[PDB]
Amino acid sequence: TLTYPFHDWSQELSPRYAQLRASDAPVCPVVSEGTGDPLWLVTRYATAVKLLEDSRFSSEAAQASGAPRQSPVELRAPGTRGDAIAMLREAGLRSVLADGLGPRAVRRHQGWINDLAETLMSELASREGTFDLAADFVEPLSSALVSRTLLGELSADERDLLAHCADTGLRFCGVTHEEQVHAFTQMHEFFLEHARRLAGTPGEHLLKLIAEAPLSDEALAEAGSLLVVAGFPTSSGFLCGALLTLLRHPDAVQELHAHPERVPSAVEELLRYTPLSTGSVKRMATEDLEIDGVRIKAGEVVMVSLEAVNHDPDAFEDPDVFRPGREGPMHFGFGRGRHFCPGNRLARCVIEATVRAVARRPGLRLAVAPEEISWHEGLFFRRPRAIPATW
Ligand code: HEM
Ligand SMILES: O=C1N[C@@H](Cc2c[nH]c3c(F)cccc23)C(=O)N2CCC[C@@H]12
Numbered sequence: 529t530l531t532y533p534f535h536d537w538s539q540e541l542s543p544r545y546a547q548l549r550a551s552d553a554p555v556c557p558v559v560s561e562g563t564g565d566p567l568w569l570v571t572r573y574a575t576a577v578k579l580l581e582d583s584r585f586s587s588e589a590a591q592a593s594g595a596p597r598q599s600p601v602e603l604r605a606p607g608t609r610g611d612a613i614a615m616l617r618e619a620g621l622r623s624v625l626a627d628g629l630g631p632r633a634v635r636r637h638q639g640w641i642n643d644l645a646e647t648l649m650s651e652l653a654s655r656e657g658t659f660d661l662a663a664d665f666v667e668p669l670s671s672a673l674v675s676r677t678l679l680g681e682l683s684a685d686e687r688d689l690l691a692h693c694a695d696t697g698l699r700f701c702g703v704t705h706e707e708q709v710h711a712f713t714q715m716h717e718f719f720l721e722h723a724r725r726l727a728g729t730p731g732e733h734l735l736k737l738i739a740e741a742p743l744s745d746e747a748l749a750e751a752g753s754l755l756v757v758a759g760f761p762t763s764s765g766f767l768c769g770a771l772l773t774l775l776r777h778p779d780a781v782q783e784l785h786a787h788p789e790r791v792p793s794a795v796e797e798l799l800r801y802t803p804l805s806t807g808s809v810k811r812m813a814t815e816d817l818e819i820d821g822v823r824i825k826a827g828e829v830v831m832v833s834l835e836a837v838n839h840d841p842d843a844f845e846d847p848d849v850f851r852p853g854r855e856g857p858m859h860f861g862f863g864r865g866r867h868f869c870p871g872n873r874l875a876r877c878v879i880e881a882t883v884r885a886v887a888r889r890p891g892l893r894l895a896v897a898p899e900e901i902s903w904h905e906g907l908f909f910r911r912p913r914a915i916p917a918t919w
C-alpha cells in the first residue's frame with residue numbers, strides 16, 4: 529500500500545527510507561504513484577551491492593517501453609527506442625565513449641573548467657551585495673560543461689530549450705502527462721535537426737566524436753537527448769546541493785582552505801552525503817531470482833534508492849554527518865556495477881573545481897536561512913530554485 533516516491537523534494541530525506549531500511553525484509557513492495565505499477569524497493573547497502581552487481585537484473589529491460597515503472601510517463605520521445613547508451617555500445621562505440629568521457633577528456637578540459645569556476649566565483653566576489661549561486665555559478669558552469677564536453681556550442685535560446693525540456697520531462701509531478709511526453713518529443717526533434725550540425729563545429733565534445741567515428745540521424749539524435757538528460761539536470765542539481773552542503777559546514781570548508789590536499793576526500797563525501805535523485809535506479813529480473821531470501825519473479829522491477837544506501841548506518845558510521853575523510857566503503861553516488869556513471873570523471877572534475885573555488889574564498893555563506901531555500905517540487909533530480917549567498 530506504500531506509494532512511491534516519497535515526495536522528499538528538499539535535502540531532508542523522507543523518513544520512510546530509514547523505516548524500510550530497518551524493517552524485517554531486505555526488499556519491500558511499493559506501488560508507483562504515477563502508474564499504479566507494483567515495484568520492489570531496496571534501501572540497504574549490502575542488498576544493493578548484490579542486486580546491482582547481478583547482471584540478471586537488467587537495466588535495459590527496466591528502461592524499455594512497457595516496463596513496470598516509477599515515472600508517470602515513459603522517458604522517451606514516442607516512437608523512439610529510448611536506450612541510447614546501449615545502442616551506442618551496440619554500434620561499437622565504447623572506445624569513443626572512453627575518449628570523450630574518460631581521463632583523457634578530463635586532461636583536455638580540466639584547465640578551462642577550473643579557470644571558469646574561478647572566473648565565476650571572482651566575478652561574484654567583486655559584486656557589492658548578494659547573488660544567486662544557482663543562477664550565477666552553477667547554471668553557467670554546468671551549461672559550459674554540457675556545451676564544451678558533450679553537445680557542442682549552444683546559443684542561449686538552445687540551452688534554455690534543452691534545460692526546459694529536461695526540467696519538464698524528468699518529473700514525478702508538477703506537469704501534465706502530455707506536457708511531460710512532449711518535452712521529450714521537442715528535445716528529440718531538436719536533435720533530429722541539430723545533432724549533426726553540432727558535430728560540425730570546433731571542439732572535442734562527445735557528440736562530435738560520436739558523429740565522426742566509423743550513424744543515422746535518429747541514432748545521433750538519441751545520443752544528444754541522452755547527453756542532455758544524463759549530464760545537465762544531474763550536474764546542475766548536484767552542484768547546487770553540494771554548495772548548500774558546503775555553506776552549512778563552514779568548519780569543513782575552513783579545513784579545506786588550510787589543507788587543499790583534502791579536497792578530493794571532500795568531493796567523495798559530498799557524493800555520499802548530498803542527495804540528488806528523488807527516485808531510484810531500477811532493474812528488471814530477466815528470470816525468477818532471489819535477493820536475500822525474497823523471490824523476485826521474472827519481469828518484476830527492483831529499485832535501489834542511492835540516497836537510502838548512502839545513508840545506511842550498517843555501511844557508514846553516523847551516516848547523516850558530513851565527514852570528509854571518513855573511512856567507510858564506496859559511496860553509491862555514481863551507482864554500482866556495470867552501469868556505474870561513465871560521466872563520473874567529468875562530474876568529479878567539475879565538483880572538485882567547485883569545492884576548490886569555495887575553499888579558496890572563506891566567508892562565503894547563505895544570505896537566507898536554510899529553511900528559506902525554495903525547492904523545485906517533483907524533479908527526479910533535486911534542485912533549489914535559488915541559492916541566495918554573500919560574503
Ligand atoms: C556530467 C556529465 C554526466 C554524464 C555525461 C553522465 C552520463 C551517464 C550515463 C550515459 C549513464 C548511463 C550509464 C548506463 O546506464 O550504463 C549514467 C548513469 C548514472 N549517472 Fe551519470 N552522467 C553525468 C553526471 C552525473 C552526476 C553529476 C551524477 C551524480 C552526482 C551522476 C550519477 C549517475 C548514476 C547514479 C548513474 C547510474 C544509473 C543506474 O545505475 O541506472 N551522473 N550517467
Ligand atoms: O529519479 C530517477 N533516478 C534514475 C536513477 C538514478 C538515481 N540517481 C541518479 C543520478 F544521480 C543520475 C542519473 C540517474 C540516477 C532513474 O532511473 N529514474 C527513472 C525514473 C525516475 C528517475
Ligand SMILES: [Ca+2]
Pocket residue numbers: 594595596
Ligand atoms: Ca509491461
